[PDB]
Amino acid sequence: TPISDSAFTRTFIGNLPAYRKGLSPILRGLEVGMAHGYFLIGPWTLLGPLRDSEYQYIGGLIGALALILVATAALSSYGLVTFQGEQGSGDTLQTADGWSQFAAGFFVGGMGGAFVAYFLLENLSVVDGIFRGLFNH
Amino acid sequence: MDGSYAASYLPWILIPMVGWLFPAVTMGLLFIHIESEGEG
Amino acid sequence: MALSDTQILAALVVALLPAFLAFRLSTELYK
Amino acid sequence: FGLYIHNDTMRALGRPQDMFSDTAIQLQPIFAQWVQHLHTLAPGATAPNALATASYAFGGETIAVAGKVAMMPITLGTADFMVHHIHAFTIHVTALILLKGVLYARSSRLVPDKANLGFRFPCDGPGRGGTCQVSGWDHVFLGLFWMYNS
Amino acid sequence: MTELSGQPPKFGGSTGGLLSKANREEKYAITWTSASEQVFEMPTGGAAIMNEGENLLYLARKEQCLALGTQLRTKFKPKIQDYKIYRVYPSGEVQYLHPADGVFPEKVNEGREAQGTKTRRIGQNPEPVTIKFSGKAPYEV
Amino acid sequence: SHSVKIYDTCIGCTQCVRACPLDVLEMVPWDGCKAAQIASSPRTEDCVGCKRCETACPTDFLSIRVYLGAETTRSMGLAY
Amino acid sequence: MATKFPKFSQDLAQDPTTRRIWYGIATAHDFETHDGMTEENLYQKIFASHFGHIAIIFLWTSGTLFHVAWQGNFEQWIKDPLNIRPIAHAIWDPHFGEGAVNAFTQAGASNPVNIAYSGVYHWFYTIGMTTNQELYSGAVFLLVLASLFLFAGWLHLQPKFRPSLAWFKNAESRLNHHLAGLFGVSSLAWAGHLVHVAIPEARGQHVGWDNFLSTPPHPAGLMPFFTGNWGVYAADPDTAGHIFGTSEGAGTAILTFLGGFHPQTESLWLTDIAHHHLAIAVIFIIAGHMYRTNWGIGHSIKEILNAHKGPLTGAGHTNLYDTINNSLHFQLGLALASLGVITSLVAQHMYSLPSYAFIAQDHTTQAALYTHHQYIAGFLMVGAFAHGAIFFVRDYDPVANKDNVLARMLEHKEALISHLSWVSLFLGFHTLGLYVHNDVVVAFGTPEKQILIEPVFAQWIQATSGKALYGFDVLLSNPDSIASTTGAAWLPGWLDAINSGTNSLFLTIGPGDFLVHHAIALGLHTTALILIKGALDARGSKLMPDKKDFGYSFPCDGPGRGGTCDISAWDAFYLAMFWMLNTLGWLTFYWHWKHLGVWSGNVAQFNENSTYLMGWFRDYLWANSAQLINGYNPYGVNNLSVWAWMFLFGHLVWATGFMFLISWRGYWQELIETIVWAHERTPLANLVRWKDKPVALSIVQARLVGLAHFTVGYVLTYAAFLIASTAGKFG
């Protein structure tokens, strides 16, 4: 079927770590993390518990830093139970500590990306214009 | 006012703790016992 | 009168004992 | 359905500004209201010969006989959007059941010789972990409940 | 056993076949000769066309192979009784399964051992109070 | 794996083997019935426990018994 | 393939699927089925489990004390126990908003708090504990006792301290120690505590661990105990004008027997309770000297059993000693039965003869405790039957118990089950017919045709104890019976307590009580029928004469022979659970509605509507739900909001059980295989391989999970109704 295998899909299915050509277990989940906390901020941008307060761009950050932590355990703690130790012979995702480092994208990755995404939203740059009420001139 | 009882800084830690302690360890224990596996 | 503040802290230190003894009995029952 | 659970828990916690209502996080149905307005403006645009709308539920006047009303515009809001999605969900599950009843009456990874067993049969033994209610007859038996629930 | 000769049946592929575990853990294959080119139903779904002469098809588990075998001899006038079911290992180890001793397990045959045969009635099984605390069941003794 | 036994009440009619869908049961020559044969279960490793044998038994109560046991990948009928 | 879960059963470990987890949990405490488990290690592991469990119970009690002494308004409630609502524990939920915050700041507390409905304030103020420091000291003592028992278990698991198998199989000594010490000495020491602390505390006299060695509980010491005359302890009893906690209207008596109710607290008298414990302590100590030990004199149970034979029972009770002594399931089934009967008795006694001060006036606590104990006993009885089935499956020896009274039960089991079915039909038919007849007759505007049967046989028994509202003039209702002229000290109190139209002591009954009692009789007969056919036909039948070879709990036998679904002795327990829950629903509806009538002074409502079912469906379910469903509204949120949420929650869980109970496995196995294919073909997901091969829940697990969800949604929903509807009209 075209959706399963086509011209663009044949490469894109084979372009993210566990299918990507020659990607190290350090970057084992770059996208798998760069795409997490960035879209987890969406539902917390205009809908959260703290959507109508002064920290509209804070609850989402902390909730993402917690949910990524949950999805990291649900990744590594299982990885160890599907494969023992050392590495494998085919793919570096299916590897033991390789899967323990599959979190290296959740970790560091999201903790910095979801951080900067709202570090740009809480602020608004210092540039404005203010009237004058002195008369002393 | 939340804590009309003595030592109001305990119930806080106690509720989160049980929150991220007992079922976390419980779900992890079954996992760990699934880990031994057996490749033959 | 009501209950003191340090006695609530004395409660956790004493509760350390049943937790520890129950841990011992639990590990002894696993065999 | 999770929307209803969330609304019940919010109204139970005493948090009105966190609900999916017409006075909070609104879930307004834009498409249905738009087609209502389309059917309302029919006699003067896409139906010059038509004098009145097809139904007054889409929008228009309020016809009443004796002391009771006959039909009036049915304003659609959050409480209508949620129940429409509930209906869609229940119908989807019923279709899933009654469809797996036909796409697997012949065989399956569980039972490869199911076609021999016929249409109406209880199972194929407690083996394979449990082969209870695999026939198309059992699937219709299950789909009856979901049609009722929808 | 030595070689699995056979032509793959005419089939446009389906999602009911073997999977990743079925290739890595174990899969099953069945070899048979067809007197002509006809259509047969797939135990995984759909209808396929078996090639004339020796055929070969790989399936997930054994029951699928035996379900196809019980179909081959019953539906077609040139009945296929030479279908041979093999279990394939991840190391290429292929062993014979069905038929066992070249003859169908239905009719009797010389050269078979009595497995699971008991010399009693079911109403003659021992009482569970006599074997408790022992790793044996009333039927295992 | 499941346990399959065959008792001396068996008349050797091959019905339980004609109903078995995994080639678990066979027939060996015996000396108890007119047919001089008794059911056999050499390949218990392929027995899923669908009770198709017991359903196809003619004697007063079963002559072949299936006792479910430690389920494995093959006994669970796993195709995935 | 085997891994290490579980480590006690290789069969469950070798399972390579997800089932390996589930059966690894549901067989945790089934020690008899472990790998190579011997008969001695079994009993020893069970002994250590008993030690740990005693410790667990004491830790729970310690927490109950701690939260009352810490967050509860115990001292305030002592001041005004009839107007100040007790406090259970404080709330620490970071999810509250404004309505719940304004509501739960109740019961005098300055924070959102939960009211107490377990009736422990009344118990603690009736004991004599009047300050939080006494409760705190008791909590510390229990925290030490639990560690004592934990270390006892840990030390007895050691080989040097490991008790022998012959020690566990000692019946003639365990009884003589449990009766004379665990029952006799315990009751005697509790009576001593009641006399030395409770009675002085009731008279303003504080007696604690700092003065009890010097202050006597009576103006005359232990010498008047040695004096053959004992009337000096009857002395001047506490007058009818006595006031609790003060020396007003208080005398010097400690051991009385005047009976009746304390007119103020509407409860029992403390001196009477202490005297009762003293008498029964003497009785239990005497019982503790029956079976022989290391001094020759005494009984041997094995001889007494094997000596009671019969011309119509053959072997009588022969070899029953060696039978029961070796079957732990027999012992557990007897213990659960007796404990459930006495738990139902505790329930059926505390509501009409309350022993705690001012506990009769609080209606929610009293409505909760009774139903609590009744559900407890309703589980205990089903357990007593489920373990008897296991005795028949695993421990019944047909050669040891040959021709005795036990084997004859199996010889005529068809007749037993047949007559149980007959009596259940004879009940159900007519009870349902009369209820439907009353409904049909009331719906047609003709309420003058209801078949209202007068409960004569029970009202007459009430008359045999002093109830004069019916006027049978029999025994205690008749002033000329020789039972009244006995000079009994308890008669004047009992006669006054029984006939006052204010208490729950022998409530006036009518036709509605008669009909609900026959519905209760149906609920008992049918549940017992199911639990008895499951135990008798647990070894075999004509569908499966070899059921003994398949064990207790097994899925089935297959679709052959017509069908074998729900054929094990475990499935009969699974079926009878529903009947126990239905009977405990009927009983609790009865109790709650009649007590609403008694509390509101409107006994007429119950006595005139409980004869037709629409009265229950409307004047009880629909009528008393108004506040319940109004815990949280689009207008506000009150203190019932948590109960209004729990009601729907219980409904949700109860309805969730229906999925597991109606749809069966194969559908779900196919639906799971589809998802397995979906994952193993999804890019960026097949690389997420699973060690545990996911499988659908087994049939046994299916029925178990469905019954568990049913039971949770049955208990929680009715509790959220019973507490909410009670804490509104009277709380």
Ligand code: CLA
């Ligand atoms: C098997 C049927 C059955 C059962 C299980 C019960 C059970 C009960 N009845 Mg009851 N009763 C029955 C039949 C039954 N009754 C019949 C047929 C009548 C006459 C209509 C009554 C009249 C009756 C009265 C007046 C009272 C009870 C009461 C009670 C409760 C207290 C127990 C008791 O009174 O002693 C046991 C009851 C009996 C021994 C009745 C005899 C039942 C026999 C063994 C069955 C055969 C009956 C047969 C048709 C009689 C032939 C009649 C003849 C004229 C032809 C109890 C739960 C009391 C109550 O209401 O509790 C609050 C009460 O006051 N019953």
Ligand SMILES: CCCCCCCCCCCCCCCC(=O)OC[C@H](COP(=O)(O)OC[C@@H](O)CO)OC(=O)CCCCCCCCCCCCCCC
């Ligand atoms: C249940 C509510 C009220 C309903 C009506 C009561 C009937 C209940 C249904 C039971 C039918 C009895 C069938 C008898 C079956 C029968 O005929 O057995 C025959 C039996 C003859 O026994 P033997 O003379 O051989 O006795 C020798 C003994 O040593 C036994 O080995 O006669 C009796 O047992 C009579 C007593 C009945 C015992 C059974 C029930 C007893 C009721 C409870 C008694 C409590 C006494 C005080 C104990 C604390």
Ligand SMILES: CC1=C(/C=C/C(C)=C\C=C\C(C)=C/C=C/C=C(C)/C=C/C=C(C)/C=C/C2=C(C)C(=O)CCC2(C)C)C(C)(C)CCC1
């Ligand atoms: C030398 C000796 C004598 C003098 C004895 C003296 C001077 C004192 C003796 C005291 C004795 C012998 C026993 C005292 C026992 C006290 C007990 C056993 C308390 C048990 C409490 C329990 C079990 C738990 C209570 C609970 C608590 C903590 C709560 O707060 C909630 C309620 C409940 C759960 C009930 C004499 C000459 C007289 C006789 C010969 C021996």
Ligand SMILES: CC1=C(/C=C/C(C)=C/C=CC(/C)=C/C=C/C=C(C)/C=C/C=C(C)/C=C/C2=C(C)CCCC2(C)C)C(C)(C)CCC1
């Ligand atoms: C399964 C089984 C079993 C069984 C169990 C059970 C089921 C038990 C129970 C039981 C019960 C559940 C019982 C009950 C009962 C009843 C009774 C026991 C009664 C009575 C009576 C009396 C004696 C009374 C008297 C009197 C009166 C009338 C009133 C007033 C007072 C007086 C006292 C006078 C076992 C384990 C063994 C074994 C195996 C099998």
Ligand SMILES: CC1=C(C/C=C(\C)CCC[C@H](C)CCC[C@H](C)CCCC(C)C)C(=O)c2ccccc2C1=O
């Ligand atoms: C849904 C369903 C399934 C499928 C159910 C599955 C696959 C279980 C999925 C549930 C997951 C595991 C989440 C459950 C969450 C629980 C609350 C966790 C409890 C576990 C404890 C350790 C806490 C069956 O297998 C089945 C079998 C027979 C009759 C009816 C049914 C049935 O209705």
Ligand code: SF4
């Ligand atoms: S059907 Fe039963 S009795 Fe007949 S041959 Fe087969 S095993 Fe023997």
Ligand code: SF4
């Ligand atoms: S139980 Fe079923 S699979 Fe097993 S031998 Fe019998 S018929 Fe074959």
Ligand SMILES: [Ca+2]
């Ligand atoms: Ca908000």
Ligand SMILES: [Ca+2]
């Ligand atoms: Ca005191």
